[PDB]
Amino acid sequence: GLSDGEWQQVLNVWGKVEADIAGHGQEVLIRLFTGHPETLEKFDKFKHLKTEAEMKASEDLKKHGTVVLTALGGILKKKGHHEAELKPLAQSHATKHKIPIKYLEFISDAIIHVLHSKHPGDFGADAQGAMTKALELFRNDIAAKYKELGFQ
Ligand code: HEM
Numbered sequence: 001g002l003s004d005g006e007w008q009q010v011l012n013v014w015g016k017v018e019a020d021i022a023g024h025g026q027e028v029l030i031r032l033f034t035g036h037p038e039t040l041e042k043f044d045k046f047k048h049l050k051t052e053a054e055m056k057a058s059e060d061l062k063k064h065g066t067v068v069l070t071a072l073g074g075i076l077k078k079k080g081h082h083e084a085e086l087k088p089l090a091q092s093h094a095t096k097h098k099i100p101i102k103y104l105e106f107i108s109d110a111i112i113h114v115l116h117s118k119h120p121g122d123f124g125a126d127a128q129g130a131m132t133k134a135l136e137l138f139r140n141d142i143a144a145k146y147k148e149l150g151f152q
């Protein structure tokens with residue numbers, strides 16, 4: 001957990017994201033914000049987005065989607081050896097942004113949804129298993145840092 005085979009699947013799936021990082025990033029955030037409107041309130045810069053149409057037309061939302069998925073991609077390519085990459089994000093998200101770990105669960109689920117939505121029939125059962133494991137590992141390691149900091 002994860003096996004070499006599983007990491008290979010994760011990084012193969014990630015190639016899909018890398019072909020259109022901004023599009024995937026945008027759809028992940030829109031899925032997050034529409035499914036869980038409380039998450040929007042954590043972003044002073046997105047609180048004005050009162051409709052999905054406005055979300056889709058927001059170039060800054062797309063920009064942030066790129067920032068988020070680029071960060072995640074860098075972490076995934078470490079294949080679990082990600083302490084240095086993950087540390088600042090756990091600290092900024094717990095201490096500055098005040099993001100409950102529950103919201104990281106939400107965004108993880110959103111990634112899985114968007115992969116199926118954008119690649120229906122091309123995100124196989126093995127691939128979903130591997131990507132889910134990778135996102136759980138990410139969450140688990142963030143959670144350990146949150147506990148250190150006494151957040152939530
Ligand atoms: C895959 C999980 C996530 C990744 C990789 C990620 C990554 C990032 C990065 C790289 C930044 C800019 C640098 C920083 O402040 O640390 C950032 C900022 C931020 N993130 Fe996340 N994030 C994730 C999940 C979330 C979630 C679920 C929320 C809220 C529901 C959130 C809220 C924020 C906020 C409010 C900012 C500051 C925005 C600004 O001031 O421009 N993040 N995130």
Ligand SMILES: O=N[O-]
Nearest residue numbers: 029064065068107
């Ligand atoms: O959109 N997560 O920073």
